[PDB]
């Protein structure tokens, strides 16, 4: 219709500008509540320009498409747009837009009272535009997760230091008795003096109790600050148990790859020590785990067991398709038979001096050497050698279909392919009875 | 029999009222132990009305059915009811009901002594009605788990602040020497003065050491408070290691859905970067993981692999039964053959521009388009198109039973069904040899 | 041979007595190092009786069998016993037995010096008998794990409070300058006075910094205590990060059963809300998860998938063997055919009003009602009913071997057995072609 | 070519020497920044000898092979070596080598200024040689993981104590007002006195706030130290939430073997208590879990399900190959038939008095006794006995191919082999129709 979708450029840059008017309007919202208690006319225009840019956006979000939850498609219908916005965030977001301190200055008051500037704390209710941006950026795959989760953990404590260093200056500044307050016991005057733009003393108190260091030079004196310190030191129990529990969740997400690798190396050194294995086979099982971690990641088979059928079969056709193409065992065969390279477990990456195929074995699989070198041997000491692109196991459908002639083992560092009795024995039926003819030509 | 079962309304509202008489009777139980040490006749009637409502419930729970543990059925037998209650919570719950301070006032005493009002601390033994309600509400599926586990974590610390701010006023109030106590060193009188209903000073001390802030304005002076601070600061080691360990368990339960999603996106970007994949296939595997998370949740296949046989087969008959009904390949077929839509993996939700079926493939499955659109193509650039309810893979049991004619790929956002060679090839035997006749009519 | 095995009664009660002489000899080992610096003749006999009971056990452990690591059998050979004990714990355990303070009093000294009573700190090296008992009791299945792991966490901190409250009294008691120490700044004399058997002041200092409360009434004054507080406050970083990390491991072991239950309920309420399921099928899938948790535990199928072959088949022969015995479909059949009740998935426990078998289905399984009641119905509203021990699905090998006549659904609370086409169709071969004869007699 | 590979001995010992010149050059880098503010000529030669050994290594790393990331092979090409080093760590590592304090002494200055010795803090940028050594040693399997991860956790806090105890002495030493600083309020002079080589006071302040103990004897006085304490106490929130989250990760890696063992024992005692099993079968299922943990580890089947095909088949040929060799059922058979001992589940280790084979069962497997003893019995009380190397189940391919004659059960402690109907029934095809002849000879 005549509705703008909630995507680029005239809306995802307007929404990024209203975030900068929430970070500002949640900094001066408890700061002018305590320190700058005049608010005559100097900052008065910025807090009304900003409050005007949040009245436009009440109008503007009756024209956004909102991306329906049960259909996963955009809704372009100005009635269902309207009933949704009027039921979730209209009675909440119009109570943060109507001016109480600027506009209702004209009735009787002087722009300052206790139960009249507390109504200006509803400009902290527009913080949901920032909290619903951290929820959106966590699922955006082009943004990091360790540096969004810590930005959410930093911005919460920076707001808890600020909003409780300005709520403990109001208890001291509005005490009818003399300086028997937390700041008055060491700095006896602290008013109309001591450089009001440097409120570092009020933040130094808040960081000392939120981190639970506690020096005791600033502490509660009157029973008004004993109530506030009880309600603040119960908040800091819940805060530091939330930062520690979140950083514990992040360290586990940090170091889970290197820890489950050191679990499987440990479990394969417990196995080769209980059974008193020789050193010549313990090195073959430990060099393989180290090379599987360097090359195949940690969970690669679980990664591409979730791709449906055609994302997986298109990965295996960019990868090693001209490897299985130009070998002699499939030469002059049709395109559609070498379009079944969909069960190649090509994640081999064998280390040097590792046996791929033993001397005699149940001949389960052929291997295709992608890059590297392999040296055949016979029962005591023989010598044959395969080159950098050949096949090393093709005598599992011929005169030795119950045995193996050589015992190959790598020399440099070799990547193989491992086609395993599902595309030569369990693929009798599709095409290519010609492959069994191409093998006997090489044996002359 | 004549026995009331432990369910609604005359028992699950009576049990909710005795919880409010435990929250009260665990607040004034250490409060009148220390501050209001008179207890002449003012609060005396409320602590005996409440103590009478706990004598009724000793009688009443000889008539409750209790829901046997090895049979999972209610026991209505007034003898086995009686032996169970007399062996678990009778010698414990009659020691919290007999009045020691009210009733044994009449022998010799004045209602106050050290070893006589400590016997009134057995009214803290009725706290098991609250602790066995948090265990019941955690397994009730109509109550939340993140806001029951934090209510249990708040009520434990609120009781630890209260019961140790009233046990450290008794050490100061009952010290025979003058004000060389923790409160006497700063407020030298603090007795018969300083507004006894405002005991905020005793809670301000307890919150300062339980959170381990520690200001040092209130500290131990005499060796009676040095013993109590040792036994209290060893409790706060075990308390804050229990709140942090529980909130770490809750944050892991909070953010496990978005963290294992960002693990699988990371593992599929490590795979497409080691193998140097082109950008045109990396976008197909990354847009699929993002859409599988939005629609199929996280573990949906593990959810409905635990439903037995008929909960699962009734889900698949409300869902997409008139989808597989009115298509041409099953038209005029019996009801009982299209009552085997029990292996439809209908959780497709394919993104736009994703290939469902390649050009040539092992023809494993037919697909039924539920909602969306799909455009067929030929080897270079062709064009055919399926509508919003048709079948896009039905040539896997006919003239191309070893191949595929088109290569379909989505355009809008499409949900499919994927019946896969278990209800057309491995269902030769039940019924419907007519389905192979309905296909040749559409090919004319 | 003539060797005692390391088991009951004359050795596992002697070893439990030497543990009580380690708990004692690790309490007075830093206590007489600092406070009771005389040690003339009063406690002198107990520290030599105890030191004699540890010289017997050097002799005695040349006659213990020790239970070999690679063979899991006891070694009774007094030579290999000897080489093992002489290589692990002989040069360590004879350095904790030879008396330096008692026995070498006779050369020149008065039983006290700095570099002579530090050699009596090697009586802390016999703590390995306690540390190797916590490792043994953790794998003993008749002892708890939550109350052994916390006893190890309590005994470590109780020793860290004691051994660092006695090492910070030696810095104050042996300072050549006057009372400008941590205790001397508030209690100026503190020597030959202030009730030496009450060293609570030295423990009150240690608990204040180990829990990191910190009051500042006792702090370091001289640069000897500034060095000790640096080496102690680096130990308390490693200590409280070890208690919090261990209690986090215990809370996860505490509450893993109720948390993964609330994960699977949540995942099945996300599934029934995205697909807009009716309320009459959402209650069937949610009442089943709640009853599977109450009765089948959490992981029962993973429990008895690890028992080898005959522990599992003997569980299923005590359980529900006279259930499958005396039914009509196996009546007059041999013992060895109803000795194949080894694939009965009897963990049914169906809730009320849950459908077991639909109206028409692939007839996969028969069910045997163990306890409860079941009511059959026909397509709209019919009525038949099975009793408390009958068979409800036996028409899957007869005239309806492609269908189902009724649609049973529970009424009370029912436990079933579910034999599923592996002991009636895939057991044609063993015995009992008579079972197909017993079915046609009941149909007359 | 003429290029040295990054391995032993002339490079992996040169790199270990430059680590000792980073540990030194990150200790005196903030130490001479604050305390030794002269730096005339005494330490001047060591900070230029060290700065010369880091100018050699800028030259030397244009000749190292670097082990390519996508090929896992060394690159010997002096052009691609050069473009890699010039793009990662050349503009970073030449800014830490050019002398600013020594070499630019000759222009105008006296070797000390604020914005001139801050440029000597770029000698902290050579710390990446230490941080990239902890990343390398974590994946080296010949080094431990619990004592590399704690060495990284100790070295971070030792640097945070040092670098913030020297940055808070510069605020006190360079304050133009008199001693109204943190150290000046208690030690009023502290300059040209109080033993400058003992800066323990500046570390005692830093350890008191980093561990959040907080005594209050040293606290901020001027508004320069109130800014530094805010920026430091926000760092200590992020530091102690990183040490606790890392030690929680290490304790879970510490005690995961004994915790999942106590989970499976608990889950098998919940199962044998709900079903009211007799004590004679509960002991058989609990003694088996305890012996499977002692011998088979925790995850042994998951260990050797990842070895490819020939590491696994060479483990089973060193292990129990002369066990299956010299038994009567395979005597005089070829080598290649007893080269298929690749499906032997030899991890039995049965406890005493445990039934291996019941009286009548589906005869699924034969067993070969490796070490131990086994006693046969008949239905009530019979007696036969197998020796220490015999076969105990071979009547599953003969006259009782639907039954079992004895019911063996162990007596001492027995390890078996369990060949299970895949090498006698599903190996009809390879060789050895002679094995069925060798069985009838033993039955005479
Ligand atoms: C130097 C100063 C300069 C800077 C000055 C300030 C600049 C401000 C700039 C703006 C900052 C942004 C502020 C808002 C950030 C957004 C916050 C947010 O999104 O947090 C939401 C968070 C939800 O949790 P999260 O982990 O995101 O959940 C994921 C799954 N939903 O939820 C939270 O935030 C949770 C926070 C934890 C709070 C714990 C409270 C525990 C309370 C326990 C009470 C105990 C009982 C007390 C009773 C005492 C009575 C006697
Ligand atoms: C009122 C008082 C009354 C009572 C008085 C005292 C009575 C004493 C009675 C005896 C008490 C028993 C004492 C011994 C108990 C046995 C201790 C034990 O077994 O602990 C071993 C434990 C091993 O760890 P655990 O988790 O058991 O391992 C499981 C897997 N192996 O290992 C541990 O213990 C670990 C302990 C943690 C220590 C952390 C140290 C961190 C160090 C940080 C660095 C310090 C040095 C820095 C130097 C660098 C300079 C910058
Ligand atoms: C206005 C301000 C004041 C307002 C006051 C309000 C009045 C209070 C209202 C009453 C309401 C609260 C009533 C009490 C709460 C009831 C909840 C409860 O008790 O829960 C039981 C809980 C069970 O544990 P949970 O983890 O739930 O177990 C799950 C699996 N069973 O178990 C627990 O809760 C366990 C408690 C944890 C404590 C652990 C600390 C013990 C450590 C001791 C260490 C000693 C070591 C000694 C070392 C010294 C060495 C020298
Ligand atoms: C007795 C005294 C003697 C003194 C001797 C001194 C000798 C020192 C010799 C040198 C010692 C080593 C120094 C270098 C340390 C080397 C280790 C290192 O840097 O490692 C990097 C480490 C990496 O992280 P790790 O978890 O290993 O990652 C694994 C997966 N990549 O990363 C880290 O280490 C991370 C650092 C810790 C994290 C700190 C978190 C702080 C964040 C909070 C900041 C808040 C900012 C607020 C913003 C306010 C905005 C207004």
Residue numbers in the entry:
A (entry chain D), B (entry chain A), C (entry chain B), D (entry chain C): 49 to 492
Which statements did the authors publish about this structure?
A three-dimensional EM map was reconstructed to an overall resolution of 3.2 Å. Cryo-EM structure shows that KAT1 assembles as a tetramer channel with a 4-fold symmetry. Each subunit contains a voltage sensor domain (VSD, helices S1–S4) and a pore-forming region (helices S5–S6) inside the membrane bilayer. Each VSD of KAT1 is contiguous with the pore domain from the same subunit, and connected to the pore domain through a short, non-helical turn (named S4–S5 linker). The pore domain displays a closed inner gate, with its narrowest constriction formed by the hydrophobic side chains of Ile292. The conductive conformation of the selectivity filter and the closed gate correspond to the expected closed state of KAT1 at 0 mV. The structure of KAT1 shows that the middle of the S4 helix adopts a 310 conformation, whereas the upper and lower parts are α-helices. We also found that the positive charges of the depolarization-gated channels Kv1.2-2.1 and Eag1 are mostly distributed in the upper part of the S4 helix, while the positive charges of KAT1 are mostly distributed in the lower part of the S4 helix. In KAT1, the short, non-helical S4–S5 linker contacts the C-linker of a neighboring subunit through electrostatic and hydrophobic interactions. We found that mutations of residues located in the S4–S5 linker, Ile189Ala and Arg310Ala, disrupt channel opening, while the Ile189Val mutation leads to a decreased current from KAT1 upon hyperpolarization.
KAT1 is a voltage-dependent potassium channel from Arabidopsis thaliana that is mainly expressed in guard cells. KAT1 allows the influx of K+, leading to the swelling and opening of the stoma, and therefore plays a key role in regulating the aperture of stomatal pores on the surface of plant leaves. Comparing with conventional depolarized K+ channels, KAT1 has a uniquely reversed voltage dependence: depolarization causes closing, and hyperpolarization causes opening. KAT1 thus falls into a rare class of hyperpolarization-activated channels, which include hyperpolarization-activated, cyclic nucleotide-gated (HCN) channels in animals, and KAT and AKT channels in plants.
